[PDB]
Amino acid sequence: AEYQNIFTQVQVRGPADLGMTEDVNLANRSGVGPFSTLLGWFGNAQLGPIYLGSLGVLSLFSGLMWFFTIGIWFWYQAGWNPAVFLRDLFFFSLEPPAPEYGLSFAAPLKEGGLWLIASFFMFVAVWSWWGRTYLRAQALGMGKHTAWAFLSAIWLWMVLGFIRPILMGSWSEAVPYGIFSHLDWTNNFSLVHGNLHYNPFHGLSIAFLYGSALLFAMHGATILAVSRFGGERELEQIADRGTAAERAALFWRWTMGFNATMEGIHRWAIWMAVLVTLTGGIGILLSGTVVDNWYVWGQNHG
Amino acid sequence: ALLSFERKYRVPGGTLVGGNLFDFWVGPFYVGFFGVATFFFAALGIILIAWSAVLQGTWNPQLISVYPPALEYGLGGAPLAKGGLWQIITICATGAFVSWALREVEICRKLGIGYHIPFAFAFAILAYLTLVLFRPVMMGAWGYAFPYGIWTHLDWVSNTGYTYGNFHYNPAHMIAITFFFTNALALALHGALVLSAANPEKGKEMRTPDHEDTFFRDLVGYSIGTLGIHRLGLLLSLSAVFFSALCMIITGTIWFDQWVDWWQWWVKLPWWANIPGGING
Amino acid sequence: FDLASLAIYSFWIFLAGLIYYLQTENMREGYPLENEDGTPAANQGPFPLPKPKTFILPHGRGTLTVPGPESEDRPIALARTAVSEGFPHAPTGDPMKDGVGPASWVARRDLPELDGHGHNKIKPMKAAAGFHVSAGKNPIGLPVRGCDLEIAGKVVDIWVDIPEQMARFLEVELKDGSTRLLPMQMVKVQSNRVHVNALSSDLFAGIPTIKSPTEVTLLEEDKICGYVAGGLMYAAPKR
Ligand code: BCL
Ligand code: BCL
Ligand code: BCL
Ligand SMILES: CC[C@H]1c2cc3[nH]c4c(c3C)C(=O)[C@H](C(=O)OC)c4c3nc(cc4[nH]c(cc(n2)[C@@H]1C)c(C(C)=O)c4C)[C@@H](C)[C@@H]3CCC(=O)OC/C=C(\C)CCC[C@H](C)CCC[C@H](C)CCCC(C)C
Ligand SMILES: CC[C@H]1c2cc3[nH]c4c(c3C)C(=O)[C@H](C(=O)OC)c4c3nc(cc4[nH]c(cc(n2)[C@@H]1C)c(C(C)=O)c4C)[C@@H](C)[C@@H]3CCC(=O)OC/C=C(\C)CCC[C@H](C)CCC[C@H](C)CCCC(C)C
Ligand SMILES: COC1=C(OC)C(=O)C(C/C=C(\C)CC/C=C(\C)CC/C=C(\C)CC/C=C(\C)CC/C=C(\C)CC/C=C(\C)CC/C=C(/C)CC/C=C(\C)CC/C=C(\C)CCC=C(C)C)=C(C)C1=O
Ligand SMILES: COC(C)(C)C(=O)C/C=C(\C)CC/C=C(\C)CC/C=C(\C)CCCC/C(C)=C/CC[C@H](C)CC/C=C(\C)CCC=C(C)C
Ligand SMILES: CCCCCCCC/C=C/CCCCCCCC(=O)OC[C@@H](O)COP(=O)(O)O
Ligand SMILES: CCCCCCCC/C=C\CCCCCCCC(=O)OC[C@@H](O)COP(=O)(O)O
Ligand SMILES: CCCCCCCC/C=C\CCCCCCCC(=O)OC[C@H](O)CO
Ligand SMILES: CCCCCCCCCCCC[N+](C)(C)[O-]
Ligand SMILES: CCCCCCCCCCCC[N+](C)(C)[O-]
Ligand SMILES: CCCCCCCCCCCCCCC
Ligand SMILES: CCCCCCCCCCCCCCC
Ligand SMILES: CCCCCCCCCCCCCCC
Ligand SMILES: [Fe+3]
């Protein structure tokens, strides 16, 4: 057996890496956590430091409030009996207000009120986390590609829980907070709209989801195959092409007739993943607002 | 034509079969013995699909659909127009996919690189074979396989899934989906991270790998590292396809009920199945 | 022609523009295409070359502008073996010494890669303030065995990527007392030895040497890793 570079053979450790400083406010960095030998077989062993500023604290607090709001509901649905809690944990569900309430915020607590409180907490948690991904990159002088990619995921979540219900006329169209119930919601969504397989934006979304697994399999395997020439040091291969970048390009050129560069493959990658939730959000947005039956809609076109 | 750095790599050697007989390029494409094999299986499979289009009586690609044999044919051969073309096309596709993998091995050898890429591609071939070979044989009929048509094969997914209730409740399906979602999340983050270092703010020098590690520690308290992320992308995508094949090989072979039943074991344990209220009492 | 129709049509036009941008971004190295004699090919394809972009390299190392006029900057000891294109080019010497085929190296800069602070990224442990082995088999002092099953030498140090806390090269002392670097990814650290499948014992001395005992430049890494990987093809009469 030749070494495959899937797991590290020999771990080394030095003083803890405190990281680049740039324009980061060092007051808000934690100390260093423990080194993990276990993780060190697959990647880096160091844990921490983490950065915890105002937006991070706002996000963690909000997110826990969202979590606690759902859990308190689950305890109440379990008659406060811990055994029913664990037994039916996957079955409990914090559902939205009934359609009678329209877009009102005056549903009683047990009849959709708590869902609206939970969703608010989730709204604050996600958007303040997004602000964090922007500012953490700005403080280090980096491009904003991570915040822009996160926006694509946020888009689908916003359409599911906020934009589409608003255009439909009722919070009852939103997604419940529950393991099994949100699955049942997804299934009923497709049934109600005439089979989501025939929503071409759903088709596009699937092609990119599959395409993302295809591309990361290709790119992860390619980089491991040229790690024997330092291939994973992708930034310096961008600044000064080495035999790793040439052989990686030539494998794919000889195999399928064209190739990428060490920088350009990361543009293929970011766009392949981002298009999943981009196309998906559009397809959900048009369902019930413009198109009631995708199969029938599909029939009268291609 | 050659890339500007390509000539020095175009040496003889590395083939598995045929010596220097097929050791050459057509344009950018390397040939090799398994390039010839790939052409053979693909061309013939394309001819058959053309034949099946004539028998079907349509030239539009959205209507062409090559069906497998009726369930009554069991695991036996079928006449061409009654499930036989599907059988021969499946033979040619399998040959093409496997030939492609062995051509990649030869290219790996001429370039002196690891074999990770054909090894990863083999997982996709195994998923395909799970649906058209392993599962149908285990259930006893070629007609449990999917049809070769753009829209008919979507209908097959829906037919098969709803046969078992809401397929969402298949627990190996849950794990597969989790890997697919986590993969696209990791891919978006990795592409973004590298581009954000090579293309930093206006007025700045290129960032270093230490900035990438620092960004992710600041963000979530851990950086997997430049090698680990490519290990991780490989792991996530292959695990997604492994559990996909697993979730299908067990459906109709060791499980026949509505998948939501599987969890009702957790619900009807004798030490809490009878407690009133809640959801399951 | 409803709104959903307009949207799906619009998306496909956006997708085609995206594909055209992505493909041109991926032609910043290695293009224009050349003929096998090195003159530019007549058929360059339907995508044009992108307009140049510039990278400002850290630590005062200059700028990079791509695409730009390309050059191998090294002799290539190969000869054309056919009038028609599409056939292999054959080595005119020793392909492992001449660095062609799977033994190829690229003329990268003869400078070490630096970390975020401007210090050498890769260092021998004995110069690496505070570094040490933490898990797995410590190979220092182990003997190094080639694919001929003879011993070539023994491990006298580990070269570590400081910022990423990773072992990248083994430093191996040969019978004459000189040393060579061996890429971590091409060795198997076993309980009683380091085994190297790519090279026979008598090919270790031909691993290219580095000019300083405490740093390795990008050019040196490419020559070293190219040489070692070329042994998979060219040391095969000894495997
Ligand atoms: C994986 C689990 C299911 C399944 C469930 C679904 C669902 C659900 C959907 C699809 C969709 C598609 N599936 Mg399917 N599909 C399966 C098996 C297959 C196989 C196969 C040989 O195993 C193939 C070739 C396809 C092919 C396709 C495409 C037509 C389409 C987008 C895929 C994509 O971009 O992926 C990622 C790959 C890439 C980006 C790279 C390019 C791949 C190219 C485009 C594939 C083209 C094949 C060509 C049409 C047929 C051969 C032509 C030759 C000339 C003979 N499916 C099995 C049965 N598939 C979607 C759709 O819209 O269908 C109409 C969709 O919504
Ligand atoms: C019976 C069920 C229906 C169906 C109903 C639906 C519905 C309904 C939807 C999908 C959607 C999707 N479907 Mg479908 N689907 C069916 C059949 C399939 C088949 C198949 C084999 O046939 C496949 C492969 C797919 C595949 C897919 C995906 C391409 C797509 C979701 C993208 C994604 O990444 O979402 C995952 C990503 C997100 C939800 C974004 C999340 C972002 C937020 C910001 C994250 C917050 C995290 C939170 C704070 C918690 C943090 C915790 C801390 C980490 C501790 N479907 C059938 C026809 N499908 C979606 C879509 O886009 O449709 C067009 C969708 O809404
Ligand atoms: C639609 C009704 C059911 C359902 C029923 C099923 C059924 C039934 C199945 C799945 C399967 C899958 N489902 Mg489900 N599923 C549903 C809802 C979902 C949802 C969701 C959000 O609701 C999601 C995300 C998923 C997700 C998934 C994946 C785990 C998996 C498909 C990928 C796969 O196996 O690829 C594997 C990859 C391949 C098969 C591709 C192989 C390609 C080959 C090797 C080469 C092709 C080459 C090409 C022809 C060459 C062309 C020429 C070039 C273009 C130049 N399902 C609902 C509840 N689901 C499938 C599965 O697990 O399969 C194992 C499956 O059969
Ligand atoms: C391109 C599309 C894909 C995508 C992209 C994407 N997601 C992203 C980003 C990007 C580019 C980010 O930058 C961002 C991120 O920070 O990544 C690390 C994010 C992210 N995507 C996430 C999740 C996520 N993304 C998903 C999907 C996808 N994301 C798409 C597939 C999914 C699903 C359903 O598939 C999920 C669940 C997060 C990891 C992160 C957003 C973080 C965030 O918004 O947090 C707000 C909430 C909190 C801060 C608090 C949550 C609290 C917990 C719910 C409970 C705690 C329990 C208990 C008290 C503690 C446990 C303790 C024990 C461990 C000791
Ligand atoms: C395991 C992780 C993912 C993966 C990985 C992966 N795929 C790969 C590789 C890797 C590592 C390659 O190296 C290889 C490649 O070369 O990529 C460019 C490949 C590849 N994955 C491809 C497609 C593909 N991969 C997919 C999936 C995945 N690939 C996984 C999710 C999917 C889907 C549906 O999810 C598709 C469509 C190809 C682009 C390529 C393999 C090319 C190949 O084999 O070429 C030889 C064959 C031909 C030229 C044609 C043969 C034609 C048949 C004889 C007739 C048609 C038969 C077919 C059954 C009809 C189907 C009709 C549909 C409507 C159902
Ligand atoms: C870091 O690194 C990285 C890179 O790089 C730096 C990369 O690039 C890549 C690669 C990734 C990308 C480029 C990104 C884009 C890729 C995707 C989005 C994934 C999706 C991919 C596709 C959809 C493309 C798929 C296309 C395929 C599968 C190839 C198409 C195939 C053909 C057109 C057919 C040709 C191929 C065949 C059949 C093989 C055999 C070759 C032949 C020509 C057939 C044989 C012909 C003959 C027999 C002729 C014989 C002639 C004779 C005998 C006469 C000779 C003459 C005499 C005089 C004697 C990655 C991952 C990477 O991480
Ligand atoms: C011991 O247990 C305790 C009590 C400690 C617990 O806390 C137990 C905790 C649990 C058991 C956790 C249970 C949690 C879950 C099961 C989570 C499941 C969640 C999902 C499956 C999410 C599915 C989708 C969610 C969506 C789509 C949300 C959308 C949100 C909206 C976009 C936000 C809308 C905001 C509104 C309406 C407020 C308006 C705001 C303005 C500014 C006007
Ligand atoms: C009406 C329907 C349209 C969609 C609605 C809005 C959805 C939100 C989605 C946002 C766009 C998707 C992400 C863009 C691609 C990923 C990022 C990218 O590659 O470009 C960013 C790049 O420049 C770097 O940013 P800078 O450092 O600031 O230049
Ligand atoms: C021949 C094909 C013609 C197709 C028809 C015409 C075009 C169709 C419509 C739309 C095409 C949209 C292409 C968008 C390309 C992405 C542009 C982009 O991303 O710009 C920002 C980018 O610099 C940031 O650079 P970095 O910060 O360095 O990453
Ligand atoms: C205080 C300690 C708290 C620790 C809590 C840790 C939770 C996150 C763990 C794994 C997420 C990994 C996601 C992988 C995506 C990384 C994308 C990438 O490219 O990273 C490369 C590397 O990090 C630089 O190059
Ligand atoms: C960024 C790479 C682009 C990948 C292109 C993917 C093409 C998939 C086409 C699927 C077609 C879906 N639909 C319903 C419109 O036919
Ligand atoms: C769905 C992703 C596939 C998109 C296909 C892009 C085709 C690129 C072909 C570029 C031609 C390369 N060449 C020969 C000019 O060097
Ligand atoms: C579903 C569409 C798939 C498109 C596959 C494109 C193949 C392109 C091969 C490029 C070869 C160009 C060589 C010209 C010298
Ligand atoms: C008398 C023989 C009748 C059975 C023929 C079955 C052909 C279809 C099976 C597909 C096999 C795909 C894998 C081939 C290696
Ligand atoms: C089902 C067809 C299999 C085709 C052969 C796949 C090639 C496998 C590569 C062999 C080497 C793997 C070593 C990497 C771990
Ligand atoms: Fe990468």
Residue numbers in the entry:
A (entry chain M): 1 to 302
B (entry chain L): 1 to 281
C (entry chain H): 10 to 248
Quote from the publication:
The RC from the purple bacterium Rhodobacter sphaeroides is an integral membrane pigment–protein complex that consists of three subunits and ten cofactors. The cofactors are arranged in two membrane-spanning branches, A and B, around an axis of pseudo-twofold symmetry. Only one, the A branch, is active in photosynthetic electron transfer. The RC includes two bacteriochlorophylls (BChls), PA and PB, combined into a special pair P, two monomeric BChls BA and BB, two bacteriopheophytins (BPhe) HA and HB, two quinones and a nonheme Fe atom [Allen et al., 1987; Fig. 1(a)]. Being the primary electron donor, the BChl dimer P is a crucial component in the RC, and the redox potential of P is a critical factor in the efficient functioning of the RC.
